[PDB]
């Protein structure tokens, strides 16, 4: 959870990415992705496009 909220704050607002990005790139498992992608887009603290293989991306809450 620090290590995600870590790297999508750096990445840089309005950027996009795919759990199977994300547990591709790191190792990190499927089944700890997808409890932990569930879990931060519920707090608020992670956008959820028009689909859960849709996109991810900090909070949409833009400009």
């Given at each position: 959870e620090q290590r995600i909220l870590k790297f999508l704050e750096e990445l840089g607002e309005g950027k996009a990415t795919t759990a199977h990005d994300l547990s591709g790139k790191l190792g990190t498992p499927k089944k700890e992705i997808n409890r932990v992608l569930y879990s931060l887009a519920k707090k608020g603290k992670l956008q959820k496009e028009a689909?859960?293989?849709?996109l991810w991306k900090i909070a949409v809450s833009t400009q």
């Open positions: 689909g859960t293989p849709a």
